[PDB]
Design a protein around this ligand. Structure first.
Ligand SMILES: *[C@@H]1O[C@H](CO)[C@@H](O[C@@H]2O[C@H](CO)[C@@H](O[C@@H]3O[C@H](CO[C@H]4O[C@H](CO[C@H]5O[C@H](CO)[C@@H](O)[C@H](O)[C@@H]5O)[C@@H](O)[C@H](O[C@H]5O[C@H](CO)[C@@H](O)[C@H](O)[C@@H]5O)[C@@H]4O)[C@@H](O)[C@H](O[C@H]4O[C@H](CO)[C@@H](O)[C@H](O)[C@@H]4O)[C@@H]3O)[C@H](O)[C@H]2NC(C)=O)[C@H](O)[C@H]1NC(C)=O
Ligand SMILES: *[C@@H]1O[C@H](CO)[C@@H](O[C@@H]2O[C@H](CO)[C@@H](O[C@@H]3O[C@H](CO)[C@@H](O)[C@H](O)[C@@H]3O)[C@H](O)[C@H]2NC(C)=O)[C@H](O)[C@H]1NC(C)=O
Ligand SMILES: *[C@@H]1O[C@H](CO)[C@@H](O[C@@H]2O[C@H](CO)[C@@H](O[C@@H]3O[C@H](CO)[C@@H](O)[C@H](O)[C@@H]3O)[C@H](O)[C@H]2NC(C)=O)[C@H](O)[C@H]1NC(C)=O
Ligand SMILES: *[C@@H]1O[C@H](CO)[C@@H](O[C@@H]2O[C@H](CO)[C@@H](O[C@@H]3O[C@H](CO)[C@@H](O)[C@H](O)[C@@H]3O)[C@H](O)[C@H]2NC(C)=O)[C@H](O)[C@H]1NC(C)=O
Ligand SMILES: *[C@@H]1O[C@H](CO)[C@@H](OC2O[C@H](CO)[C@@H](O)[C@H](O)[C@H]2NC(C)=O)[C@H](O)[C@H]1NC(C)=O
Ligand SMILES: *[C@@H]1O[C@H](CO)[C@@H](O[C@@H]2O[C@H](CO)[C@@H](O)[C@H](O)[C@H]2NC(C)=O)[C@H](O)[C@H]1NC(C)=O
Ligand SMILES: *[C@@H]1O[C@H](CO)[C@@H](O[C@@H]2O[C@H](CO)[C@@H](O)[C@H](O)[C@H]2NC(C)=O)[C@H](O)[C@H]1NC(C)=O
Ligand SMILES: *[C@@H]1O[C@H](CO)[C@@H](O[C@@H]2O[C@H](CO)[C@@H](O)[C@H](O)[C@H]2NC(C)=O)[C@H](O)[C@H]1NC(C)=O
Ligand code: SIO
Ligand code: SIO
Ligand code: NAG
Ligand code: NAG
Ligand code: NAG
Ligand code: NAG
Ligand code: K
Ligand code: K
Lengths: 353, 334
């Protein structure tokens, strides 16, 4: 009785679901209408063909926003690389590290949204879309061109940006990891070591990242691509300091607001980078099966009593399993006493109790 | 029935206590030295070789680095900087000991190219700091506007806690310098394998005179993976770790338990990685197992209770409406 169920769910109505499916509600005989009731729900933010990761890094932005105590993620659907001879594995790594940070922090905050980050840069040089391919163009982090008067990429360069209005922000700190090239006119042995740092101007804390690999962007030596760390930053005034190659800084941040009592996120799939990202204590991964977004919605109509490592317990009283990492009102697997002294209602002259 | 008890305890024999009843001294599950603490051993010469391993880890110490004794690096320094250091330190140890079985100390060595050596720059009349080590300038430099560096390797543990510190203020080199001459301390650690850099610049303008007091050492506490590291100093005295907290043997997340002049440990001890317990009858909980350890306290029995355990660990009772299964029962009979 009350076996744990392998599904994402909620304890009450205070939940929110981020998705990459079609969220909208797309008849005298009402059983022909196949929209689930939660279609168009204000507890769902979802766009077919997009995702938090895509909107965080690329031009085809969708304005994901949501607030809830129990946050749920539906993750679903060659691969992206910055350069013709890049490496998509770096992007699989970026994705795992992004969602690790998003999943972890959404166990601590009610509210997620995106904000645009502006910068102040003292030079004349402008942004350049250095990282792209045939279907997608990267715009976060922004990359700033060489000043016309510098003859090569061996220069220092900085810009200011401010983060305001949220408790914490998730931003990308990235470098091209390998032998970066300034131009194809250059010699083969002339390469650069991308180096980037963010500096809190008030606290004096520096987050830095130096390129360390030897890969490049040719058929003989391929692999050069963007490696990103995802930083959770407090609000304040920051300076992006580049010691070599192109200055990069954030153009978009995930805004985190409204702290809650720690409540693990729940994640479900239709790569396994979301699986790698979803770890205890901050995330419960569910490998649910019949898995369409439309089936998820129907499965989110009713509450459950307890959400735990093994799954969802519908009922709050007893189970054959002991809940581990339980949240909510969790059942016991103790077997219940047959009798106690309250039970008998008369003293027997000849039998003991 | 089965109200939660405001005590520290264990779910089984797999527990350990760090600190400063006779029965438990023989248990082989205590590491404690009167007059000392983890923080104190981390930073100072008065070192105790704390060491212990367990699934449920308990801490009962911190008092032996108070504000009433009150340490500062300089005559006109600031103990509150050291209070803040304490909070950050214990925040990191508590969070990490929810994830690892074993805690211990290791000594960290370095390679440095110059002839200059350690200087005990931070000390009061009854305590000398040796972690981080500070390396004095080369005799050939007349000012302190230089770049100094040393290598150090971290080996033998899954993670290491080390201090990254700067003097935060208008740091002085010698009294012979004019008042207007001063330094802005800058320290960083660089992982040569990964390319990740952690840096820290002084941002305050306070000093070490009666007229402008407050210059002391501010430390961040980094959890680093094993590898080859480089301490890079861009100004003032080079500093790098001499001791590290050695974290070993990963475990399924199990919150630490903490019991008690200051409340830095209370700030350090936060859900979900730590359970703080107020006020011995609290330490008596180590004599026996309990079924469930939760935010409200320890639940002795694993079946029923009047409270719903929150952040429960073990075999946790329900607070549903349940009675006894015998047909003879009426009051409380399911
Ligand atoms: C959840 O689990 C708990 C813990 O296991 C369980 O509580 C136990 O229930 C069992 C079975 O009912 C109790 O055992 C019975 O005790 C009968 C005597 O009852 C009196 O004495 C009890 C012993 O008291 C001493 O020890 C306890 C600590 O152990 C200590 O607190 C006391 O101070 C004292 O030193 C006493 O606990 C008990 O008190 C309970 O019941 C009264 C009366 O209703 C109530 O007022 C109290 O609030 C409290 O709930 C009472 O004072 C004894 O006659 C009986 O023996 C018969 O049956 C057994 C088999 O069942 C035969 O072996 C025997 O031959 C007899 O036929 C039996 O031993 C046990 O004492 C409980 N323990 C505790 C700590 O409460 C709950 O029932 C479980 N609940 C559910 C829903 O499953
Ligand atoms: C992380 O990356 C940056 C960029 O590579 C490093 O900064 C650069 O370090 C190199 C090598 O030490 C320096 O090159 C030197 O240039 C000077 C001229 O000033 C010359 O005398 C040397 O022979 C050498 O060619 C370069 O100056 C320096 N650039 C800047 C802007 O500081 C940085 O050191 C790396 N971080 C770590 C921790 O290694
Ligand atoms: C834990 O909670 C659940 C749900 O509240 C309890 O299960 C429910 O138990 C009731 C009472 O026993 C069941 O109703 C009865 O069912 C029997 C047999 O079918 C019937 O003869 C009675 O006339 C009455 O309808 C109910 O079906 C059942 N619900 C479910 C979903 O299974 C359970 O008993 C609780 N367990 C304990 C130990 O408290
Ligand atoms: C954090 O602290 C370090 C150490 O103070 C900063 O590096 C230092 O920055 C100062 C201020 O820009 C540099 O001063 C310059 O000195 C040169 C000659 O030495 C002079 O030609 C310039 O006009 C200027 O006065 C200093 O060189 C530099 N030190 C080193 C070793 O690189 C660092 O910039 C701070 N970090 C951030 C992110 O602000
Ligand atoms: C980025 O931020 C700098 C402030 O630290 C600023 O540099 C200064 O110019 C401001 C403007 O009045 C001065 O108040 C200040 O003295 C300067 N810097 C320092 C450290 O004191 C830069 O100008 C800003 N960059 C851009 C492009 O606006
Ligand atoms: C899931 O639980 C929530 C919170 O308990 C339910 O909200 C309750 O709604 C019913 C009427 O529909 C009321 O009896 C309660 O007072 C409501 N709670 C609050 C806090 O106002 C919600 O109904 C449940 N969802 C489902 C599908 O049963
Ligand atoms: C707490 O529980 C532990 C483990 O369940 C108990 O350790 C057991 O003790 C018995 C009796 O000495 C041994 O026969 C078992 O083999 C022990 N198991 C282990 C894993 O060590 C311990 O006795 C309990 N403590 C108390 C006070 O009851
Ligand atoms: C201080 O404690 C440490 C850690 O427990 C001791 O170092 C360990 O010693 C054992 C052998 O007893 C070795 O197998 C381990 O490799 C050591 N651990 C580490 C991290 O190096 C050390 O011996 C103790 N020092 C003294 C003087 O007793
Ligand atoms: C062929 O693609 C590359 C190259 O490897 O040469 C990628 C190269 O980008 C990197 C990170 O090496 C790019 N360099 C700059 C500074 O824009 C570089 C220049 O845009 C190109 O040389 C001029 O066109 O283009
Ligand atoms: C004891 O007071 C001070 C001072 O305020 O000047 C503290 C000063 O230390 C710091 C961190 O300011 C110390 N300087 C050095 C480089 O060791 C400095 C030298 O020991 C001393 O001035 C050398 O003569 O002494
Ligand atoms: C996008 O969402 C943000 C945060 O929820 C909101 O403030 C803003 O109205 C939205 N922007 C647009 C263009 O709709
Ligand atoms: C950021 O920019 C995009 C497109 O320029 C816009 O639609 C979005 O609403 C902006 N976010 C905010 C918080 O204004
Ligand atoms: C580190 O050094 C201290 C003081 O000399 C010593 O007592 C301790 O045993 C050393 N630790 C290790 C792991 O060698
Ligand atoms: C530190 O390591 C670097 C790289 O391995 C090496 O070039 C240098 O000689 C080392 N410095 C010292 C002082 O040993
Ligand atoms: K750069
Ligand atoms: K320094």
């Amino acid at each position: 009785f009350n076996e744990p169920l392998n599904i994402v769910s909620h304890l009450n109505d205070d939940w929110f679901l981020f998705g990459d499916a079609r969220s909208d509600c797309t008849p005298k005989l009402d059983w022909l209408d196949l929209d689930p009731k939660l279609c168009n729900s204000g507890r769902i933010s979802a766009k077919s063909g997009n995702s938090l990761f895509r909107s965080f890094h690329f031009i085809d932005f969708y304005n994901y926003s949501g607030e809830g105590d129990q946050v749920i993620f539906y993750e679903g659907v060659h691969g992206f690389k910055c350069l013709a001879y890049g490496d998509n594995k770096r992007w699989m790594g970026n994705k795992a590290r992004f969602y690790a940070r998003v999943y972890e922090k959404m166990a601590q905050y009610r509210s997620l949204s995106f904000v645009n980050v502006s910068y102040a840069y003292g030079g004349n040089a402008k942004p350049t879309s250095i990282c792209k391919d045939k279907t997608l163009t990267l715009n976060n982090p922004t990359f700033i061109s060489k000043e016309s008067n510098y003859v090569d990429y061996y220069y220092e360069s900085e810009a200011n940006f401010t983060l305001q209005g949220c408790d914490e922000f998730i931003v990308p700190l990235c470098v091209f990891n390998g032998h970066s090239k300034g131009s194809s006119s250059d010699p083969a042995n002339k390469y650069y070591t991308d180096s980037q740092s963010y500096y809190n101007m008030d606290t004096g804390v520096l987050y830095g990242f130096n390129s360390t690999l030897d890969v490049g962007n040719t058929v003989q030596n391929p692999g050069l691509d963007l490696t990103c760390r995802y930083l959770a930053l407090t609000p304040g005034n920051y300076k992006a300091v580049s010691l070599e190659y192109l200055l990069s800084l954030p153009s978009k941040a995930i805004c985190l607001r409204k702290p809650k009592s720690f409540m693990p996120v729940q994640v479900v799939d239709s790569d396994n980078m979301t699986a790698v990202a979803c770890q205890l204590p901050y995330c419960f991964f569910r490998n649910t099966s019949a898995f369409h977004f439309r089936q998820l919605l129907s499965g989110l109509l009713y509450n459950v009593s307890c959400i735990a490592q093994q799954g969802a317990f519908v009922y709050n009283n007893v189970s054959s399993s002991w809940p581990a990492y339980g949240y909510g009102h969790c059942p016991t697997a103790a077997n219940i006493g047959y009798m106690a002294p309250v039970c008998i209602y008369d003293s027997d002259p000849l039998v003991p109790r």
